[PDB]
């Protein structure tokens, strides 16, 4: 991979070849990206799995959740064409993107009463049925996650453009807990170490010891980061990684930060999160052993909409850990209000 | 780091920003690179260390060995200017680049009888002295490595151009065994995982399981690869890494290869090595349990200059492991001649 790359911070120019770790985590939602193989395979898979108690599908990536909104009419139409009483009802998504328990599985011998080419058009809509299949949505009460499908898709055919970007997906032959490794990134060049995917930009730097510096999340999946794409993954303690393993945190020493512990109960219920190390405007933090223990993260503004003046931390390290999102500014799990109870 | 990179194998084009892992391991010896700070500091350091039995310096990188060939006249001149009877005699280098036992150390208070600027010219040469300091060379008998200096330099001031490339070095404040981490590379993008430095291009790929595919060495240092720049460094067995830890092998699972063991006694005495997985022309390998055990690597051509027809391996995996260099073609440690004794 040859080319030339300019340096913004160093005010220099470089040229050469090798491995390029790329953007498209920020500045837009490019890489739309997902589209399956011949949908007859998926239709046969879902109609086969419906008989053993598969009641829903929980998305593993919000891009693939957006994918499902483009085949549900086609899937309903082909399901009706095969004289099986089953309808699919999709829905929206809000974090945290939960994790299912069961998964799709071949049966690679599909329903041979379907078409073969991609030229079928002039499709007609369907109606409601007594037996309905739900898709990722706010219906956690009717059917639990224990009876839904999760992580049953994988990229094949090298999955790229032209034109915008195009992965052609095949359903996973085996159950798995890790994320999809055919689109992942991890690199380090003498000052920074980034971990990248569709929605994660965990990046660390070195001032005096290697530690996390900033991260950005456009989604919060529940698939474990595979250990084959994590730098410096030895002797790592689960009680010190900033981003928990359950929320796709890389099991690495670059996830550490001195004076901090695991952020299990942070403001993860948001959909978009910025991980900087500053103060929220109008607020200050002071180190004090008299401050209370670490509890769930609290917004810097009350429900009525009033700011908080002072803050205290037990054994944190300046600058503090704060969050960002649509609703405003949050703080770390180890920081409590100075005197407010 | 924004820019655009073309794809040669994929016949596609990509653009974006992020982290770029670069070339300048091949196609020439760019990045010349090394040059120190004010040489008075090094002169004071060497004249101070000479009194405790420091008899030589063993280069940690061949680039820094080439560095020492540009200050030995200046170092001799400043040493003579300070009325200390000590002369420095440098030499050439041949692999394997050995490792010393002691190291330079401040004493940051230098000899204040020196100059301050970099404008001193019209220098005069010196003569021989009773007390001589040797530099990396073929003199392993007069003074052992146990009384030499090793790994006493580190990059500072961000160490880059303009123009060709320029690191400004400072001597290490503490002893260390690992290499210098301020110029290292490691990256992985969905098919390949490379580890890069001044002279190493260890690269792995994935066909069915992640395994080493090719590597190139322009030098063989003896500094341990630091674990903070190695991908997938968990549960690694020392008896299975292809490149040994002593010869700057990354402690990683990407260094593995099924059916192979550690190449402790390979053809490392060469200076340049290519690590492919083919046959040497005119030779063939067959798997046979009757073949002998693994012994030191043997050239495919005899001393007289005759090729070897057949080869056998005990528990290898096709294609075999072969080497390259100036002298010709070598083979792996686990492969022996079929019938030659």
Numbering used by the authors:
A (entry chain B), B (entry chain A): 1 to 341
Original authors' sentences:
We have also done focused refinement on one of the dimers of the loose tetramer and it is determined to 3.4 Å resolution.
NS1 is secreted alongside dengue virus particles during an infection. It is a multifunctional protein which exists in different oligomeric forms intracellularly and extracellularly, and they play distinctly different roles. The intracellular NS1 (iNS1), exists as a membrane associated dimeric form and is a part of the viral replication complex. The extracellular secreted NS1 (sNS1), exists in higher oligomeric forms. sNS1 likely causes vascular leakage symptoms in DHF/DSS via two pathways—indirectly, by stimulating the innate immune response through activation of complement and Toll-like receptors, and directly, by binding to endothelial cells causing endothelial hyperpermeability. sNS1 when bound directly to endothelial cells causes barrier dysfunction of the cell monolayer as demonstrated in an in vitro trans-endothelial electrical resistance (TEER) assay. Here we show by cryoEM that the recombinant sNS1 exists in multiple oligomeric states: the tetrameric (stable and loose conformation) and hexameric structures.
